Design a protein around this ligand. Structure first.
Ligand SMILES: O=c1[nH]c2cc(Cl)ccc2o1
Ligand SMILES: [Cl-]
Ligand SMILES: [Cl-]
Ligand SMILES: [Mg+2]
Lengths: 142, 128
């Protein structure tokens, strides 16, 4: 998937498509909008192809990663979603939404201790008060 | 992954990992890089294998390539902030002090590793 592609690219350390600016920013913006057009109409498979395409070109992009993680979470591919949410957080650092969603994924992965750590981080560090309420409601049930 | 099909026994992979670190510790960087690349081909999902290759890239002053692997390495452990610490170092070398500051601050705010936080704080203290 997207992560193995990123790791292969780093191993081989050859020229990538982004390194040569093979797709301009404006076209990447268009494709991202098309990806969500598919997603918003429930065409999840096509959206996934488009977000995979975006993540091959520019993996280290919080917006592309978050789109793909959402798809995996909807498809109940919870480990793949949590892995991408963690990448997104490492790049973004200031938005705790991926940490919240990782907590949800860990709950489904039968890892309540990992989920608890996620929700507690949201509570202690997020300034999104509504997200904190949601995290607390998961914490109350664990 | 080749790991998924158990193409090489577990103990032999342990041996290869320890040999890679031997090369690294002896300054045999080119050989260590071959061995860590070998490991990461065998199992891209092994955080310690990725961290080894990232360290090689950082030593070779390929700071963006190192930072890219550190971001993957962080996701593959979720709770270990050491790759975030090293990313902060790489960002300083890339002349991105605000990005570096964010990394070291994240270590201090989330990590339970007290020795690592001590190191991150010493970087934060130095950043203008
Ligand atoms: O300690 C941590 N930080 C984390 C960040 C994400 Cl995205 C998930 C789990 C975590 O555990
Ligand atoms: Cl993958
Ligand atoms: Cl900066
Ligand atoms: Mg607060």
């Amino acid at each position: 998937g997207s992560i193995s592609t990123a790791v292969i690219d780093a191993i081989n350390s050859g020229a990538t498509l982004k390194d040569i600016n093979a797709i301009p920013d404006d076209m990447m913006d268009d494709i991202y909008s098309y990806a969500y057009d598919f997603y918003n109409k429930g065409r999840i498979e096509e959206a996934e192809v488009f977000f995979r395409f975006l993540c091959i070109y520019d993996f280290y992009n919080v917006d592309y990663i978050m789109g793909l993680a959402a798809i995996y979470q909807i498809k109940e591919q919870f480990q793949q979603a949590a892995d991408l949410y963690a990448v997104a957080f490492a790049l973004g650092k200031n938005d705790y939404t991926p940490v919240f969603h990782t907590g949800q994924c860990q709950l489904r992965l039968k890892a309540p201790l990992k989920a608890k750590e996620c929700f507690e981080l949201v509570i202690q560090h997020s300034n999104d008060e509504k997200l904190k309420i949601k995290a607390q409601s998961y914490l109350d049930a664990i």
